[PDB]
Design a protein around this ligand. Structure first.
Ligand SMILES: COC1=C(OC)C(=O)C(C/C=C(\C)CC/C=C(/C)CC/C=C(/C)CC/C=C(/C)CC/C=C(/C)CC/C=C(/C)CC/C=C(/C)CC/C=C(/C)CC/C=C(\C)CCC=C(C)C)=C(C)C1=O
Ligand SMILES: CCCCCCCCCCCCCCCCCC(=O)OC[C@H](COP(=O)([O-])OCC[N+](C)(C)C)OC(=O)CCCCCCCCCCCCCCCCC
Ligand SMILES: CCCCCCCCCCCCCCCCCC(=O)OC[C@H](COP(=O)([O-])OCC[N+](C)(C)C)OC(=O)CCCCCCCCCCCCCCCCC
Ligand SMILES: CCCCCCCCCCCCCCCCCC(=O)OC[C@H](COP(=O)([O-])OCC[N+](C)(C)C)OC(=O)CCCCCCCCCCCCCCCCC
Ligand SMILES: CCCCCCCCCCCCCCCCCC(=O)OC[C@H](COP(=O)([O-])OCC[N+](C)(C)C)OC(=O)CCCCCCCCCCCCCCCCC
Ligand SMILES: CCCCCCCCCCCCCCCCCC(=O)OC[C@H](COP(=O)(O)OCCN)OC(=O)CCCCCCCCCCCCCCCCC
Ligand SMILES: CCCCCCCCCCCCCCCCCC(=O)OC[C@H](COP(=O)(O)OCCN)OC(=O)CCCCCCCCCCCCCCCCC
Ligand SMILES: CCCCCCCCCCCC(=O)OC[C@H](COP(=O)(O)OCC[N+](C)(C)C)OC(=O)CCCCCCCCCCC
Ligand code: SF4
Lengths: 209, 155, 115, 88, 115
């Protein structure tokens, strides 16, 4: 770890997180599908969607977890997957000064249980996920758009939603109000193909198809 | 002569309007921070006669300082409409001019001039407090050259 | 005569200023301009709906105490009487009972606004 | 008290009166036993609108489980009479 | 395979009940919407627009897709009843400023290249 430009490794935390990852997978085998720890010491628990309330309740209340803070909750859209959406829970433990990431999956039509009962912070994060991705959360105290405009159709953060959308607003003097019309751009957004045709990272080379 | 009199009356009302500009207390995004510094002691917009007032019905100028989104656009037009005339609009910053950093967003209006008329465009991201003050003094010169009464006199 | 002429002049000047305000300027009236103001979005309901008064009890008490000023204001003239012992007794009695009323309402949580 | 009670003749008249104000029904084609779908040519949502008119006329709430079966004017008369205890 | 978690309705018969319930709520709301928003349309035009929106999805046979449509429709209704929407948002269903685009092949041929 004497190299000036390279990030030093903390192998003490890597062992501790790996040990605790097994600990959770042993206590919740009904829901835990995969556990992993990254090279920068971030623990991820990948669970079945049914285990959202059991897993998070254990991680918030168990005396050896005490993850009392929901740092963030978000979704990632991966169209190539059968379940294109990936719900990500980032939890913080103040007692043990540690962080854990819990991940599950769903699709356009399958609900995911709301975690408001476990974390009051999830009220708006689930509204944002629904608003921006179209993932329905069952038993949410009140689910509705939070960021998009009233009457806005579609879910902007899906990978198949266009960057500039489908409609745009102006003011029309005939009707004396702001109207919505199909989008026309004076200058089209210029798509840049930046990817280099040479592999950058051999460590991540996927097996040939 | 009648042309001489209307010329002097025009110089009087034009003077009164440019010396007592009252911007509406209306800011949207980062550009409103730079608008606060124009009211801060270094530049002291109040010394030019420019005083903020919150009610649109007591405002003479709207400074669209920040990004205008589709959700907010109806609100902007409403408060602009509720301004008694004569009323001038100053567009501050890239976002309010033509969308700026967010020109190609599904939720951003590509320029406040699609919603309201604009008298002065102040460039920058954000314009410095001294660059907004240039636009205000450029608006005052624009009002100084109005010919409302002279144009009436020869209708 | 003087007082009436002074009042007529003050409210005539006030009226003429209002008249000039509406007839001198150039007007451009249209529907959106004269709509009610609610920060940019249309008001959700009528401004004529009931507006709960949380200090209703204190407002009723103001009616009773505002009548003590009518009874207390004659005191400067009352002090000119030859019956000072009686006058001073009833002056203090009247003020004290006004104070006991305040104490009763204060202690019984009457001056606290309703939730 | 003194207001006349409800009679099956009265219910039938009011039901047939509402159905005549409906714009999609031909006034000289309405039979007290004509099916809303088969005879009058109406569709599902048209039937829903009719039931809501009945609620306004008779001033009581008809749930969807029950309203899904009222497919002719006579069935409405039976349901209203049945729920209003008008055995007359 | 083919076994999926439902949202609200376990079959189309159950789902259609929620569709009818939503339609009755929208139908009763149009008179209030045309009143509060001071729209220059009639109650007939508004209720025709509601019907147009419902028939637009009459071909759906998946109960889950129907459940989301009702969920989205109820959010629209909630936005309108509480006047979160403005007059501009309620009139976007009528496309009053959109010039009628051609439908037949010849008219599309003359104006441009789009299919
Ligand atoms: C950081 O995060 C963010 C916020 O968080 C803070 C935000 O907020 C916002 C949103 C931002 C905004 C809405 C704009 C913010 C801009 C500012 C400049 C606010 C910052 C702070 C200030 C203190 C600015 C000014 C406010 C005050 C209170 C200063 C006090 C001084 C004054 C001069 C105000 C008025 C005072 C006086 C004494 C009266 C003057 C008023 C007049 C109308 C002039 C005189 C009146 C008359 C009627 C004329 C007189 C003569 C008459 C009537 C005739 C008499 C004679 C005859 C002959 C008839 C954003 C986007 C944001 O990102
Ligand atoms: C109480 C209300 C009374 C209402 C009755 C009318 C009162 C009129 C008297 C007040 C006149 C305003 C003061 C004159 C303008 C002034 O001083 O600015 C100088 C201005 C100053 O120039 P400036 O505005 O470009 O200054 C720019 C800022 N500096 C200089 C710091 C860079 O110079 C001008 O001459 C501009 C034109 C002034 C026009 C005045 C015409 C008045 C003619 C009388 C018409 C009939 C009256 C009735
Ligand atoms: C305390 C102070 C209270 C008193 C304040 C006194 C103010 C002293 C200013 C005197 C000058 C007033 C003139 C401004 C009138 C408003 C205006 O600009 O209207 C323009 C209008 C514009 O009319 P226009 O014909 O050019 O066009 C109107 C049509 N549109 C809207 C489409 C443009 O012109 C006039 O009305 C001519 C004004 C005649 C001169 C004023 C006569 C009355 C006052 C002096 C006697
Ligand atoms: C005595 C009444 C005193 C109160 C008058 C208040 C007032 O003038 O408000 C204007 C109100 C408000 O009216 P308004 O708001 O519809 O518009 C006034 C100006 N016009 C109509 C041209 C657009 O109007 C009046 O009632 C004026 C009454 C006549 C006053 C004498 C006019 C002489 C003009 C020279
Ligand atoms: C009989 C009606 C015709 C009489 C002539 C006429 O109405 O024109 C006067 C005009 C016509 O009404 P107006 O509504 O067109 O004038 C509005 C004011 N201007 C045009 C200046 C913007 O009204 C006036 O009396 C002029 C207002 C003078 C303001 C000074 C205070 C007066 C008190
Ligand atoms: C300042 C210049 C503007 C003109 C000022 C007013 C001009 C004088 C008005 C007037 O006519 O004054 C006399 C009149 C009656 O007053 P008086 O004769 O004393 O009443 C009988 C008492 N035994 O007074 C009156 O009748 C009162 C009229 C109302 C006041 C006039 C408006 C006052 C505003 C003046 C500034 C504009
Ligand atoms: C001098 C009067 C001294 C009495 C106190 C006056 C100030 C008011 C204090 C009220 C708060 C208090 O501390 O006493 C409360 C008193 C005792 O009751 P308690 O159960 O202990 O607690 C209240 C339960 N609600 O609860 C009570 O019962 C209050 C009883 C007094 C109510 C006001 C009447 C005061 C008596 C009149 C005094 C003036 C004499 C007037 C003579 C003219 C007669 C014509
Ligand atoms: C209470 C009762 C109110 C009565 C109405 C008062 C307002 C209207 C008066 C206009 C009279 C007129 O005629 O002025 C107009 C005349 C010229 O007329 P013209 O060009 O033929 O106009 C025909 C119509 N155009 C113009 C559309 C083609 O210009 C002048 O020489 C002076 C005009 C300015 C007003 C001078 C007064 C200065 C006062 C200063 C105060 C500080
Ligand atoms: S123009 Fe620049 S400073 Fe102003 S709101 Fe946009 S990004 Fe912020």
């Amino acid at each position: 770890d004497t190299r000036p430009t390279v990030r030093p490794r903390n192998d003490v935390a890597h062992k501790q997180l790996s040990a605790f990852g097994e600990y959770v997978a042993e206590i919740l085998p009904k829901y835990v599908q995969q556990v992993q720890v990254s090279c920068f010491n971030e623990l991820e628990i990948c669970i079945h969607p049914d285990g959202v309330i059991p897993v998070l309740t254990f991680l918030r209340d168990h005396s050896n977890a005490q993850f009392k803070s929901l740092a963030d909750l978000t979704a990632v859209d991966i169209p190539t997957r059968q379940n294109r959406f990936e719900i990500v829970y980032n939890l913080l433990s103040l007692r043990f000064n540690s962080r854990i990431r819990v991940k599950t999956y769903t699709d356009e039509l399958t609900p995911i249980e709301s975690s408001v009962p476990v974390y009051k912070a999830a009220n708006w994060y689930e509204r944002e996920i629904w608003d921006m991705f179209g993932v329905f959360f069952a038993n949410h105290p009140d689910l509705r758009r939070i960021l998009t405009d009233y009457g806005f159709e579609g879910h902007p953060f899906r990978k198949d939603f266009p960057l500039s959308g489908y409609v745009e607003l102006r003011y029309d003097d005939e009707v004396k109000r702001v109207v919505a019309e199909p989008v026309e751009l004076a200058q089209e957004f210029r798509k840049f193909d930046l990817n280099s045709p040479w592999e950058a990272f051999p460590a991540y080379r996927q097996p040939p198809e | 002569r009648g042309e001489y009199v209307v010329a002097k009356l025009d110089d009087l009302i034009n003077w009164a309007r440019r010396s007592s500009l009252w911007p509406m207390t209306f800011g949207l995004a980062c550009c409103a921070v730079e608008m606060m510094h124009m009211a801060a002691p270094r530049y002291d917009m109040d010394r030019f006669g420019v005083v903020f007032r919150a009610s649109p019905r007591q405002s003479d100028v709207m400074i669209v300082a920040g990004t205008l989104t589709n959700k907010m656009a109806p609100a902007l037009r409403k408060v602009y409409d509720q301004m008694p005339e004569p009323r001038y609009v100053v567009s501050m910053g890239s976002c309010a001019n033509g969308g700026g950093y967010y020109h190609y967003s599904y939720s951003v209006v590509r320029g406040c001039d699609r919603i309201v008329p604009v008298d002065i465009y102040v460039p920058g991201c954000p314009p410095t407090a001294e660059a907004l003050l240039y636009g205000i003094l450029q608006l005052q010169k624009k009002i100084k050259r109005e010919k409302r009464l002279r144009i009436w006199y020869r209708r | 005569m003087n007082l009436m002429l002074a009042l007529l002049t003050n409210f005539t000047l006030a009226t003429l200023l209002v008249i000039i305000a509406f007839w001198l300027p150039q007007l451009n009236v249209y529907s959106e301009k004269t709509s009610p103001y609610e920060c940019g979005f249309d008001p959700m309901g009528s401004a004529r709906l009931p507006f709960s008064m949380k200090f209703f009890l204190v407002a009723i008490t103001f009616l009773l105490f505002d009548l003590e000023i009518a009874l207390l204001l004659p005191l400067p003239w009352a002090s000119q009487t030859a019956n000072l012992n009686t006058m001073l007794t009833m002056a203090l009695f009247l003020i004290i009972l006004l104070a006991v009323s305040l104490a009763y309402e204060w202690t019984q949580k009457g001056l606290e606004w309703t939730e | 008290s003194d207001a006349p009670p409800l009679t099956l003749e009265g219910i039938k008249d009011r039901v047939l009166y509402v159905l005549k104000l409906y714009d999609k029904i031909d006034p000289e084609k309405l039979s007290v036993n004509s099916h809303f779908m088969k005879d009058l040519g109406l569709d599902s949502l048209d039937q829903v609108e009719i039931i809501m008119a009945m609620e306004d006329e008779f001033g009581f709430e008809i749930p969807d489980i029950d309203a899904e079966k009222l497919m002719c004017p006579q069935e409405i008369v039976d349901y209203i009479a049945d729920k209003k205890d008008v055995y007359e | 395979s083919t076994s999926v978690k439902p949202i609200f309705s376990r079959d189309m018969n159950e789902a259609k009940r929620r569709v009818r319930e939503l339609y009755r709520a929208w139908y009763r709301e149009v008179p209030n919407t045309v009143h509060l928003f001071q729209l220059d349309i009639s109650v007939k035009q508004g209720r025709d627009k509601v019907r147009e929106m419902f028939k637009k999805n009459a071909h759906i046979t998946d109960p889950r897709v129907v459940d989301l449509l009702v969920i989205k429709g109820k959010m629209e209704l909630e936005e309108t009843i509480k006047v979160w929407k403005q007059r501009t948002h309620v009139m976007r269903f009528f496309h009053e400023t959109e010039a009628p685009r051609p439908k037949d092949f010849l008219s599309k041929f003359y104006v441009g290249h789009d299919p």
